[PDB]
Design a protein around this ligand. Structure first.
Ligand SMILES: COC(=O)N[C@H](C(=O)N[C@@H](Cc1ccccc1)[C@@H](O)CN(Cc1ccc(-c2ccccn2)cc1)NC(=O)[C@@H](NC(=O)OC)C(C)(C)C)C(C)(C)C
Lengths: 99, 99
């Protein structure tokens, strides 16, 4: 699709077998999802945004389906009220910025 | 252009007579630039994201060239960890997310 930027670029994604809403964020290195149980082992990570740093749990080889594309890679689980899809997964589905 | 997301989508921007590097940031409502001098009056604004909030000064109708494309709009100036171009100016240059 071509997503315009009049509003926040929030789309539906599939994680854990369920549909969720997440913002496609070209300014995010990483994918960060609100608290939830994921399969497997995790490692601590610290990530920084506009207001400073938070601690999150890093899960590897997590599948998130986006527009029919299966991206697989690192997903961070943190205390955020939303889901952010970062570049690490958007690269896998072929997402580009165009102007 | 068409910009892939394997690296941070950082472009050259011209603002206030200076060249700066800035991140094309679909996860930003606003455009936020490190401390600098801008013409005109300003209003206080509080903006937030990961880690919490920072205090910034809002300047309106600022001329800014983004990768060779003209935009005139609101620029927020404050202690941002990173210079970001937000949706408010990316829409002006016709930027879309595509996959
Ligand atoms: C290397 O660091 C990062 O990549 N940091 C990322 C990050 O915070 N990205 C920022 C840009 C940035 C990068 C590095 C340091 C400082 C800032 C944004 O891409 C995402 N971010 C955090 C963010 C992500 C998703 C959402 C959101 C909203 C509705 C539904 C789903 N998500 C809101 C804020 N957005 C904001 O903070 C914006 N806030 C904003 O627009 O608030 C309305 C600002 C900028 C205008 C302040 C993550 C922590 C998400 C991985």
């Amino acid at each position: 699709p071509q997503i315009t930027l009049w509003k926040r670029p929030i789309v539906t994604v599939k994680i854990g077998g369920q549909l969720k809403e997440a913002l496609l964020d070209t300014g995010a290195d990483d994918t960060v999802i609100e608290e939830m149980n994921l399969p497997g082992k995790w490692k601590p990570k610290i990530i920084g945004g506009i207001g400073g740093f938070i601690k999150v749990r890093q899960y590897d080889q997590i599948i998130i389906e986006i527009a029919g594309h299966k991206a697989i890679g690192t997903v961070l689980v943190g205390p955020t009220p939303f889901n952010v899809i970062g570049r690490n997964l958007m690269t896998q589905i072929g997402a580009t910025l165009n102007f």
